[PDB]
Amino acid sequence: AMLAEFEDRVAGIPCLIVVTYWEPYVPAKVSGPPEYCYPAEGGCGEWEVRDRRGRPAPWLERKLTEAERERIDQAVFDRMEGR
């Protein structure tokens, strides 16, 4: 569904980011013998740009650059991993 929404910007234009899937971050096991160690999991998911009413915003989606996608990826992580 629609897990969370927050106000942000795409190339300076106000929008809503809606998070549609979130895989919770699960820490790696690093302490102790290597035989018991394992990598981290999750800390990623799926999000979309929307207008302030939560409607599709294809005109903003087209304005996303890879730089913006990377910045918003981190904004989503911080929102979903917050308290």
Coordinates of C-alpha atoms in Angstrom, one line a residue:
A1 CA 0.0 0.0 0.0
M2 CA 1.1 3.4 1.1
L3 CA 3.4 3.1 4.1
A4 CA 4.4 6.7 4.7
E5 CA 4.4 10.1 3.0
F6 CA 6.6 13.1 3.5
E7 CA 7.1 16.5 1.9
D8 CA 10.2 17.0 -0.1
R9 CA 11.3 18.6 -3.4
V10 CA 12.3 17.4 -6.8
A11 CA 14.9 19.8 -8.3
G12 CA 13.5 22.4 -6.0
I13 CA 9.8 21.9 -6.8
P14 CA 7.6 20.9 -3.7
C15 CA 6.2 17.4 -3.8
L16 CA 5.1 14.5 -1.7
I17 CA 7.3 11.3 -1.5
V18 CA 5.2 8.2 -1.0
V19 CA 6.9 5.1 0.2
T20 CA 5.2 2.0 -1.3
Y21 CA 7.5 -0.7 0.0
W22 CA 10.2 -0.7 2.7
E23 CA 12.5 -3.5 3.7
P24 CA 13.7 -2.8 7.2
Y25 CA 17.4 -2.5 7.7
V26 CA 18.8 -5.6 9.6
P27 CA 22.3 -5.1 11.0
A28 CA 25.1 -7.4 9.9
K29 CA 26.6 -9.8 12.4
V30 CA 30.2 -8.8 12.6
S31 CA 31.4 -9.8 16.1
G32 CA 32.7 -13.3 16.8
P33 CA 34.0 -16.1 14.5
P34 CA 33.5 -15.7 10.7
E35 CA 31.4 -18.9 10.6
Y36 CA 28.6 -17.1 12.5
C37 CA 28.9 -13.8 10.7
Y38 CA 26.3 -12.6 8.1
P39 CA 25.7 -9.5 6.0
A40 CA 23.2 -6.7 6.6
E41 CA 19.8 -7.0 5.0
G42 CA 17.3 -4.5 3.8
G43 CA 17.4 -0.7 4.3
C44 CA 15.9 -0.1 0.9
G45 CA 12.5 -0.1 -0.8
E46 CA 10.3 1.7 -3.3
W47 CA 9.0 5.2 -3.4
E48 CA 7.2 7.5 -5.8
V49 CA 6.9 11.3 -6.4
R50 CA 3.3 12.5 -6.0
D51 CA 1.5 15.9 -5.8
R52 CA 0.4 17.2 -2.4
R53 CA -2.9 15.2 -2.7
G54 CA -1.0 12.0 -3.3
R55 CA -1.9 11.9 -7.0
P56 CA 0.6 10.8 -9.7
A57 CA 3.1 13.4 -10.8
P58 CA 4.6 12.2 -14.0
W59 CA 5.8 15.8 -14.8
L60 CA 7.9 15.7 -11.7
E61 CA 9.1 12.1 -12.2
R62 CA 10.6 13.3 -15.5
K63 CA 12.5 15.9 -13.6
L64 CA 14.2 13.4 -11.4
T65 CA 17.9 13.1 -12.0
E66 CA 20.1 10.3 -10.7
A67 CA 21.5 12.7 -8.2
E68 CA 18.0 13.5 -6.9
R69 CA 17.0 9.8 -6.8
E70 CA 20.1 9.1 -4.6
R71 CA 19.3 12.0 -2.3
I72 CA 15.6 11.0 -2.0
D73 CA 16.7 7.3 -1.4
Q74 CA 18.5 8.5 1.7
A75 CA 15.6 10.7 2.8
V76 CA 13.3 7.6 2.5
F77 CA 15.8 5.6 4.6
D78 CA 16.0 8.3 7.3
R79 CA 12.2 8.5 7.4
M80 CA 11.6 4.8 7.5
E81 CA 14.4 4.1 10.0
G82 CA 13.5 6.9 12.3
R83 CA 11.7 7.1 15.7

